[PDB]
């Protein structure tokens, strides 16, 4: 369903925007290792969905 695609793309994009806002809070290096990993995972997922489902 086109709707499920639209919905999951919005879920990933909202999670990425929220994470980038959390990354403006500051924190220690370990916190940024966690956030960088999550950020890259989200960007990667959005990319796969774009490439495959468009």
């Amino acid at each position: 369903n086109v709707e499920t695609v639209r919905s999951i793309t919005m879920q990933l994009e909202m999670a990425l925007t929220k994470l980038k806002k959390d990354m403006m809070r500051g924190g220690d290096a370990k916190q940024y290792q966690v956030w960088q990993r999550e950020s890259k995972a989200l960007e990667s997922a959005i990319a796969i969905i774009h490439y495959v489902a468009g």
Binding site: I8, Q11, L12, A15, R37, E38, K40, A41, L42, E43, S44, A45, A47, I48, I49, Y51, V52
Partner: peptide
């Protein structure tokens, strides 16, 4: 979807569609 489940399913879609590094970045998470 629970977010991590969604990411895991997308990584699997990645591995079946030639997007291996993207799938690996998700697996690192």
């Amino acid at each position: 979807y629970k977010l991590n489940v969604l990411l895991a399913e997308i990584a699997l879609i990645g591995t079946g569609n030639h997007y291996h590094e993207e799938a690996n970045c998700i697996a690192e998470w």
